[PDB]
Structure formats: structure tokens, C-alpha cells
Amino acid sequence: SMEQVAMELRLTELTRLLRSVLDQLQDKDPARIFAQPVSLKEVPDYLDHIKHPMDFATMRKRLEAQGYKNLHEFEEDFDLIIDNCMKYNARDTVFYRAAVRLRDQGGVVLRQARREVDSIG
Ligand code: NA
């Protein structure tokens, strides 16, 4: 139908805007601490600690499949990255500190993305 096409074009455009959002957030992680899944070879007990692992590569896969239906879903996954890190790692670690910086710097990006998504529909 024409409506299914129109809905598909809206999802494509959302995907384009979330891709730019993801690029901007990942720039706030220049050490690449959150770029890939935590390695189960190297942290073999990780899944005993963290039930829903997340990282930027995994988000990018979902994004390119048009798997985010709205900005809320995308923010949920970003928040897992931060929140998982802040639980597994102690406050005095490079990892925890990197997550706090990512959260603080990403807040700005996500604030305007919410306005852009509401504005463009
Ligand atoms: Na902790």
C-alpha cells in the first residue's frame, strides 16, 4: 500500500537521524572503551554480573537493520552501555570514569535529538 511505503520512508528517515546521533555519541568515547562487546573470553564471569550487555557495535547492527522504532528504544540501549559499566566497574577506574563522561557529554546530543524527532514527526 501507499501507507506502508510512507511508514517505511519515516522509519528510514528516523534511521538516518539515529545514525548521526550514534556517530556523535561514539565520538564522546575516543578511547573506544564502549566500541565492542565485553569479551567473554577475557571476562568469563561477565554474564553472571550483567544481564543485558550492550555496546556501540551491537547498536550499529540493530540500527542498520532499522531495528529502532523510536528514539526511546535507542536511548534504552545507550543507557545500558553506561549503566552496565557503572555497575561492573568500581568508581575509581578508567572504565567507570569513561562512562560518566560519555553520559554527561551524550546528554546534550540526546536533548536535541529528542527535539528533532518531535519536530520532524
Ligand atoms: Na559496582
Side-chain angles (χ1 to χ4, degrees), residues 1-2 4-6 8 11-15 17-40 42-60 62-68 70-110 112-119 121:
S1 69
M2 213 23 257
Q4 290 303 318
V5 171
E8 297 160 2
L11 178 61
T12 301
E13 284 306 293
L14 174 66
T15 303
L17 178 157
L18 299 179
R19 190 181 305 111
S20 162
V21 177
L22 183 64
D23 290 346
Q24 280 178 80
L25 294 172
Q26 188 154 27
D27 289 343
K28 309 312 185 159
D29 172 36
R32 294 191 76 81
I33 291 168
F34 307 104
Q36 293 293 331
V38 168
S39 169
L40 303 176
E42 297 167 16
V43 189
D45 73 354
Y46 189 70
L47 297 185
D48 291 347
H49 292 266
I50 297 296
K51 300 293 162 181
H52 296 100
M54 194 42 57
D55 65 275
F56 287 130
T58 302
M59 292 188 63
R60 197 168 294 281
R62 183 169 167 191
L63 180 65
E64 292 311 330
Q66 303 189 345
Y68 292 113
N70 52 58
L71 177 63
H72 181 70
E73 290 183 350
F74 175 98
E75 290 172 306
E76 283 188 326
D77 271 354
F78 180 65
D79 285 343
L80 278 174
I81 292 178
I82 298 311
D83 292 342
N84 288 348
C85 184
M86 291 177 74
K87 290 171 191 75
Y88 190 79
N89 304 104
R91 211 155 36 245
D92 75 335
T93 60
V94 61
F95 308 102
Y96 185 112
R97 289 168 174 282
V100 163
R101 293 164 61 84
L102 177 61
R103 189 199 59 190
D104 286 354
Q105 296 192 269
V108 179
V109 170
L110 293 174
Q112 202 54 43
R114 162 52 65 206
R115 295 189 68 83
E116 283 180 295
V117 160
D118 291 357
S119 186

